[PDB]
Amino acid sequence: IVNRYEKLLSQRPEWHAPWKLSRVINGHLGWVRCVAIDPVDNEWFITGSNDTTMKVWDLATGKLKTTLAGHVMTVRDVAVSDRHPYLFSVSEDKTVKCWDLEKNQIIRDYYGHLSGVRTVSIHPTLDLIATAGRDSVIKLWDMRTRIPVITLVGHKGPINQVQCTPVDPQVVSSSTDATVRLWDVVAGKTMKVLTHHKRSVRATALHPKEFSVASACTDDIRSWGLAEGSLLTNFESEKTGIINTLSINQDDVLFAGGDNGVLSFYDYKSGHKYQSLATREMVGSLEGERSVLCSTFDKTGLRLITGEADKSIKIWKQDETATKESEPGLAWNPNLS
Amino acid sequence: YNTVIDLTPAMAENFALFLQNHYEVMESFQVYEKTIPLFPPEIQYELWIEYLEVATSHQLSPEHIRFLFEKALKKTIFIAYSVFEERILISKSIEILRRLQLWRMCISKAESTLGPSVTRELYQECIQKAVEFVIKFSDFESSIGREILAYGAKLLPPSELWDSFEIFELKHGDKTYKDMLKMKKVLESNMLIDSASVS
Amino acid sequence: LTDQIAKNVKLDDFIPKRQSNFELSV
Amino acid sequence: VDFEIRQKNWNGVREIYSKYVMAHPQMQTWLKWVRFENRHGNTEFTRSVYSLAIDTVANLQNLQIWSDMEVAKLVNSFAHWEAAQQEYERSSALYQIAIEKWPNSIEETISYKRKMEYETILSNNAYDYDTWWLYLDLISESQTFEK
Numbered sequence: 001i002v003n004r005y006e007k008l009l010s011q012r013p014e015w016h017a018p019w020k021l022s023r024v025i026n027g028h029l030g031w032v033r034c035v036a037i038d039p040v041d042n043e044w045f046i047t048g049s050n051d052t053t054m055k056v057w058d059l060a061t062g063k064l065k066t067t068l069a070g071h072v073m074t075v076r077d078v079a080v081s082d083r084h085p086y087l088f089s090v091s092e093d094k095t096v097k098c099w100d101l102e103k104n105q106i107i108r109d110y111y112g113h114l115s116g117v118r119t120v121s122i123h124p125t126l127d128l129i130a131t132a133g134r135d136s137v138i139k140l141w142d143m144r145t146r147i148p149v150i151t152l153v154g155h156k157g158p159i160n161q162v163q164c165t166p167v168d169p170q171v172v173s174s175s176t177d178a179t180v181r182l183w184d185v186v187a188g189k190t191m192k193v194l195t196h197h198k199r200s201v202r203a204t205a206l207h208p209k210e211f212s213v214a215s216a217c218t219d220d221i222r223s224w225g226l227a228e229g230s231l232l233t234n235f236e237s238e239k240t241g242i243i244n245t246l247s248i249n250q251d252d253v254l255f256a257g258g259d260n261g262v263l264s265f266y267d268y269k270s271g272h273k274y275q276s277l278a279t280r281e282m283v284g285s286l287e288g289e290r291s292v293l294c295s296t297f298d299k300t301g302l303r304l305i306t307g308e309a310d311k312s313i314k315i316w317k318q319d320e321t322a323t324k325e326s327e328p329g330l331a332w333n334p335n336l337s
Numbered sequence: 338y339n340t341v342i343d344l345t346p347a348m349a350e351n352f353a354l355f356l357q358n359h360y361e362v363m364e365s366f367q368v369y370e371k372t373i374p375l376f377p378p379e380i381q382y383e384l385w386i387e388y389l390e391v392a393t394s395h396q397l398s399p400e401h402i403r404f405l406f407e408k409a410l411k412k413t414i415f416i417a418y419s420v421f422e423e424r425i426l427i428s429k430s431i432e433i434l435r436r437l438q439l440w441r442m443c444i445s446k447a448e449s450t451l452g453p454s455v456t457r458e459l460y461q462e463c464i465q466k467a468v469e470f471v472i473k474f475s476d477f478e479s480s481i482g483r484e485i486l487a488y489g490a491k492l493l494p495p496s497e498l499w500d501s502f503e504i505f506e507l508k509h510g511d512k513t514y515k516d517m518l519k520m521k522k523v524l525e526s527n528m529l530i531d532s533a534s535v536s
Numbered sequence: 537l538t539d540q541i542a543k544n545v546k547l548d549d550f551i552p553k554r555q556s557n558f559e560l561s562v
Numbered sequence: 563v564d565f566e567i568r569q570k571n572w573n574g575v576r577e578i579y580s581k582y583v584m585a586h587p588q589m590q591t592w593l594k595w596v597r598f599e600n601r602h603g604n605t606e607f608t609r610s611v612y613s614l615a616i617d618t619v620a621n622l623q624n625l626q627i628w629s630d631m632e633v634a635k636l637v638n639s640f641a642h643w644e645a646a647q648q649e650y651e652r653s654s655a656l657y658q659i660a661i662e663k664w665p666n667s668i669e670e671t672i673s674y675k676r677k678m679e680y681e682t683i684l685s686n687n688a689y690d691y692d693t694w695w696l697y698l699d700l701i702s703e704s705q706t707f708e709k
Contacts, residue, residue: 001585002622004555009625011558211562225553225562233554269558333626400695 008334013270016253018327019263019277019304022317025062027055032307033075035294039082042299046087047313048075054089057313059298068099070106076133079120088129092116096131096141110141112148123164123171130171132159138173140185152183154190161204163213169226172213174201180215182229192229196222203256205246207268214254214268216243221256223268234337235271240264245294250301257292257306263316274329282310346372346380350387357391366392378411385409389417399425412440419447427451438467445474457485468496476503494524501525563598572602587618589632593639609647612640616656620663633664634683657681672704 030050281290422430
């Protein structure tokens with residue numbers, strides 16, 4: 001096995017650049033529980049929240065365009081279509097509500113979950129929403145007729161996070177019973193399980209190119225290849241967890257938000273963790289309220305958006321000075337996992 | 338004889354005594370080196386006490402014997418060693434003693450040998466039957482003399498009729514007030530209360 | 537029988553495939 | 563292995579220890595390996611696989627996994643046991659590669675003591691200065707300019 005360890009002292013990864021804090025946007029009155037940004041014009045967030053509003057911010061200036069209210073209890077999640085001009089948001093009152101942007105109103109209510117709904121995603125080529133939450137099944141909503149065509153039965157626990165992809169394995173989901181399934185829809189059943197993680201699997205993301213999926217866990221953040229449901233890599237992470245979120249990028253940066261209030265960026269290829277940051281919590285807050293509840297990257301790949309339990313959004317910028325000058329991070333001493 | 342070593346401390350000391358009778362001296366000390374690598378901190382002490390008393394008796398160079406106590410150290414050893422240091426650096430020895438009541442009593446004695454001032458200082462280390470000793474040092478401390486007198490109060494209150502005679506003597510010494518004195522007897526009475534309250 | 541006994545689990549499924557080479561292509 | 567000891571299989575137990583140390587490059591893996599042999603006796607086994615230990619340790623040593631104190635205990639233990647094997651030129655030869663690779667008739671009485679005094683490792687400032695008091699007294703009593 002030592003072979004394996006000799007190899008890891010060669011390749012010596014991919015210099016990436018630091019990050020820092022460009023901007024802080026207050027204005028929500030609760031925690032900020034999801035962010036989702038235009039797949040087209042990059043002018044605007046849309047930001048979930050725990051006061052049940054959803055405010056639409058402006059990317060460049062940081063001003064507030066509008067408020068879409070219209071939920072009773074907290075909104076967990078949002079998604080914005082590419083093809084359609086729609087916006088599905090979903091909350092914990094058990095309801096998955098389409099929106100229509102052109103008029104800024106609600107349109108279709110999809111319906112039938114037994115209990116609160118923690119995640120939506122919007123399949124790319126088919127016109128289908130997919131959703132799931134504490135019921136432990138993943139429903140696949142047809143969009144115009146509102147029928148839940150198919151229900152993916154499955155795990156043994158709340159479902160934290162659902163992702164869609166164009167070829168097979170079409171739908172991928174992770175769940176507090178510590179798996180991650182890879183679903184084959186028409187068949188209607190699981191095509192593969194990846195069991196490794198040790199406790200709940202709390203986040204995921206899809207490499208926007210490489211066709212694989214980062215799956216966090218509590219304290220150890222693996223990747224996985226699709227098609228085979230390989231293993232691929234294992235990011236060097238001591239216990240910094242609890243990992244709330246992942247975000248991949250176009251340059252193969254990886255983000256990961258902690259609840260201890262630490263941003264942890266990685267290279268994707270490697271596992272090398274090349275930067276950490278204490279997120280200055282806030283004015284009058286409570287040390288527990290430093291944490292990070294969501295992340296995403298704009299469409300350019302150069303700007304970071306996160307919400308935080310202290311009722312605010314922060315936007316992080318990729319500092320250009322860098323190169324090597326005195327750039328380097330933690331300097332690559334791969335260890336025995 | 339060494340053929341035995343390939344395959345019994347009494348035997349060892351005996352053999353070293355042979356070479357001592359032949360007065361090979363340094364060779365003999367070597368034997369004690371070869372014994373102690375064997376028997377570990379138990380039997381090795383049984384070798385080591387005689388080995389120290391003897392080797393110190395021989396050369397009587399600082400660094401070599403200093404090192405020898407260093408090897409040695411891993412209670413009486415501290416005393417031999419300290420006895421060495423005082424008459425061949427002194428403060429260094431005081432640091433060593435600094436490094437159980439009888440041991441506390443000694444250090445204080447050697448510090449007094451370096452002069453008076455340290456000894457009052459020593460007691461403060463001493464506090465952490467011992468109160469009788471801290472009282473024994475404090476007695477001539479403030480008694481020959483404010484932090485020390487207040488310390489005398491703190492110690493007298495630390496845990497006693499003779500001590501009452503002491504505080505009464507300190508009050509009587511002034512040509513320092515009946516009020517503070519009655520307050521003192523009141524506090525000691527409170528100590529009688531906390532003592533009687535104990536099961 | 538060595539294969540019959542533990543048959544399912546096998547070590548090649550613990551072992552990450554980009555540890556050897558980065559750049560393995562997907 | 564605690565099984566195979568309850569068989570004979572003194573062949574196969576080595577096969578185990580092979581798999582074990584090769585899949586666990588750790589000190590007391592090797593030390594268990596050898597303490598085994600020293601229990602079951604074969605000296606040409608023992609020495610030889612001591613060699614197989616030290617050539618990999620030093621060989622891939624650059625690869626950084628083995629900490630200083632590990633290497634040390636291998637040195638002191640295996641060399642010390644070479645002194646137990648009555649090859650002293652070989653003992654201090656091994657030792658010699660170590661310190662090399664790494665940062666009337668009582669004349670040899672002084673040379674053996676002075677070499678062992680300098681041979682005592684000294685990490686730090688006061689530790690090396692304490693050793694300077696030892697070897698200087700040894701030099702004093704017994705390249706006078708280079709010392």
